[PDB]
Swiss-Prot record, chain B:
Protein name per the record: Ryanodine receptor 1
Note, other: Binding of [3H]ryanodine indicates that the heterozygous channel is activated by Ca(2+) concentrations 4-fold lower than normal. Single-cell analysis of cotransfected cells shows a significantly increased resting cytoplasmic Ca(2+) level and a significantly reduced luminal Ca(2+) level.
Post-translational modification: The N-terminus is blocked. Channel activity is modulated by phosphorylation.
Similarity comment: family membership: Belongs to the ryanodine receptor (TC 1.A.3.1) family. RYR1 subfamily.
Reported tissue expression: Detected in skeletal muscle (at protein level). Fast- or slow-twitch skeletal muscle.
Cell location: Sarcoplasmic reticulum membrane
Domain notes: The calcium release channel activity resides in the C-terminal region while the remaining part of the protein constitutes the 'foot' structure spanning the junctional gap between the sarcoplasmic reticulum (SR) and the T-tubule. Pore opening is mediated via the cytoplasmic calcium-binding domains that mediate a small rotation of the channel-forming transmembrane regions that then leads to channel opening.
The organism of origin for this protein: Oryctolagus cuniculus (Rabbit)
Function field: Cytosolic calcium-activated calcium channel that mediates the release of Ca(2+) from the sarcoplasmic reticulum into the cytosol and thereby plays a key role in triggering muscle contraction following depolarization of T-tubules. Repeated very high-level exercise increases the open probability of the channel and leads to Ca(2+) leaking into the cytoplasm. Can also mediate the release of Ca(2+) from intracellular stores in neurons, and may thereby promote prolonged Ca(2+) signaling in the brain. Required for normal embryonic development of muscle fibers and skeletal muscle.
Assembly, per entry: Homotetramer. Can also form heterotetramers with RYR2. Identified in a complex composed of RYR1, PDE4D, PKA, FKBP1A and protein phosphatase 1 (PP1). Repeated very high-level exercise decreases interaction with PDE4D and protein phosphatase 1 (PP1). Interacts with CALM; CALM with bound calcium inhibits the RYR1 channel activity. Interacts with S100A1. Interacts with FKBP1A; this stabilizes the closed conformation of the channel. Interacts with CACNA1S; interaction with CACNA1S is important for activation of the RYR1 channel. Interacts with CACNB1.
Curated annotation (Swiss-Prot), chain D:
Tissues where this protein is expressed: Detected in heart muscle (at protein level). Isoform 1 and isoform 2 are ubiquitous with highest levels in brain and thymus.
Domain spans labelled PPIase FKBP-type: 19-107
EC number: 5.2.1.8
Annotated family: Belongs to the FKBP-type PPIase family. FKBP1 subfamily.
Protein name: Peptidyl-prolyl cis-trans isomerase FKBP1B
Pfam families named in the record: FKBP_C
InterPro entries on file: FKBP-type_PPIase, PPIase_dom_sf, PPIase_FKBP_dom
Catalyzed reactions per annotation: [protein]-peptidylproline (omega=180) = [protein]-peptidylproline (omega=0)
A GO MF term: peptidyl-prolyl cis-trans isomerase activity
Coiled coil (UniProt feature): none
Function: Has the potential to contribute to the immunosuppressive and toxic effects of FK506 and rapamycin. PPIases accelerate the folding of proteins. It catalyzes the cis-trans isomerization of proline imidic peptide bonds in oligopeptides.
Ranges that cross the membrane: none
Amino acid sequence: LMPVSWSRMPNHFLQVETRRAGERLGWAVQCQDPLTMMALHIPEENRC
Amino acid sequence: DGTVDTPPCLRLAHRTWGSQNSLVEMLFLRLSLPVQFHQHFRCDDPEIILNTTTYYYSVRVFAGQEPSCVWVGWVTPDYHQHDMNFDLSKVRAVTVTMGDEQGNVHSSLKCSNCYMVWGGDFV
Amino acid sequence: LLLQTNLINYVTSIRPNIFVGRAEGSTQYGKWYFEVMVDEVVPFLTAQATHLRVGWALTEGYSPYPGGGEGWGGNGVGDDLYSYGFDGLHLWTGHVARPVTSPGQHLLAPEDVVSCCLDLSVPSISFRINGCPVQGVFEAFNLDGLFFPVVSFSAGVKVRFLLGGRHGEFKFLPPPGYAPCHEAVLPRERLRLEPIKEYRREGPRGPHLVGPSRCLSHTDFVPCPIVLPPHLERIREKLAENIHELWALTRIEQGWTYGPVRDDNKRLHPCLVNFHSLPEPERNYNLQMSGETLKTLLALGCHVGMADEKAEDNLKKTKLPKTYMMSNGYKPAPLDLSHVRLTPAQTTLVDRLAENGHNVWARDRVAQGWSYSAVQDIPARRNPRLVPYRLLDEATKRSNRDSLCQAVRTLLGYGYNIEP
Amino acid sequence: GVEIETISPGDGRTFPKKGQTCVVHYTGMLQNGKKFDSSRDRNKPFKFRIGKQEVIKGFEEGAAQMSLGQRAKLTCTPDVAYGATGHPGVIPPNATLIFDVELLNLE
């Protein structure tokens, strides 16, 4: 078990819109645009 | 190599246990291939050995190593606790229980990310 | 035996700054509640199902990363041993779905309100959706760290938070024993919404990269705490008479007069004449507060010695004008400390004493059966300063500091020196 | 061995009758969870006629047991589909199948 490893940043992230609306409705959060990626599996370890 | 007196085996020996920057900390050994439990549960003689579903492996702690600082068992892939202060209290274990609308329970499942024993609990 | 490829969705995780945990020295409640109202979910924007779960998570263990990870991918709440998820019809924990028996069970449809019952005394997490409770709970999990609410979502999900009446408005009544979640906010930080363990933060001039977040520890909420020499035994009542005379000068400066009753609304002070005019419970209090701050003064390593009692006695009292005398006409005469200037070593030591004195006070208050909330509920055992001293905001931090700066330079005006 | 567990309820009254077509936006898995099939990736609402045994037996028996617009999780046993040999190349022998269907329209 080595402690750290080099991974790769993705090129885009989820655009999150957080804003409190109203003193009784509360804090709102939303997202609309979808972003997907391809993934390998290595099935012997279940680590994509 | 595996002999007539010894099974096929593999060891771990410390290189620098003497002086000159002898590093020592609690390292974690996992093997490389998993075993797979069957899809549904059940719910030597050549007859018994060709129908059996139960398996055995073995470790042998050498002399000069304390079983107080040895933990042996089984580990599922979603386990990433890397600490030098690990004791068996520091094992994740979550108990899931479900019941009816009456409140009487139906099942009590415990998932743990680690299934081991303590070698210090025998010697 | 080979590798498999697939398109999957992204997930993130968000939380408020509400980190509840228990320990031995527990200034916290241990049984909380909050609500989440879902109003806009597309079931299928992508090829994969739209991921949306709600639950609780630890601090030091749960680290969702935007790609890869354990399982097939898109791992979020309940996807390992550090969080416990619910989606409407499954209990997500340890990366496995658990089929539940809920009345009218379905996914998190719009116009639904889910709730999370949490207990820290017994390890217990429960849920109700739209007032209707679920038939399954979690047990026996570890308690080494804090807990905060988490919702993990895929794209195409709009949802709102219901934290407490000052911010949300609870669409259901909490079961008795469950505090509204806007109470565990720390005094140093307002309520805010944030991601977890992130590295990218979109800035003005380009995007920004951040380092690892510094998390509050598990035991950052427990507070912390001999013989007495005879040369300080006599001066203990001397500073005690100095402290009450300085208090009555502080009382008369705002408008407290000498009254037989103690009425703050009428501005009445029964300790406004002199320290001997203070009652015997207040006279014993002025001495036992004197012996406490001195036995801890030697305990930190500050060496004290007795010298120059003549120049100490030659220092007169502070001048009290006609405006300084209250309605009773008796202005107290505390010892003058205008000659003594406190050192930066003493300015360091004046904070370490007020840190200890406030935390040993709340240690008695924690033994008195009290816990923190942002609101002040005295019969419900809530005092808004029930934290350790560095978690206290600067105003009360200054308030005990200017309180303890009075006793320093007068004892320096009593001739006694302080080593560091 | 046709177990239907609901995911989202539909009309509750409209059911497919025989001699009729359906449009199902399905997807399937195995018991290990490996996703061997979908329909949305091909962006095509899959259609078929009931009764005429175009699909396997565990599929159309699950199909008439749904309402219009309902979303159901099926579980087809080994004996009801691809029993001994299984599909060549795709589905292994004696494999239990797990489906996620949705009746789009047309009964």
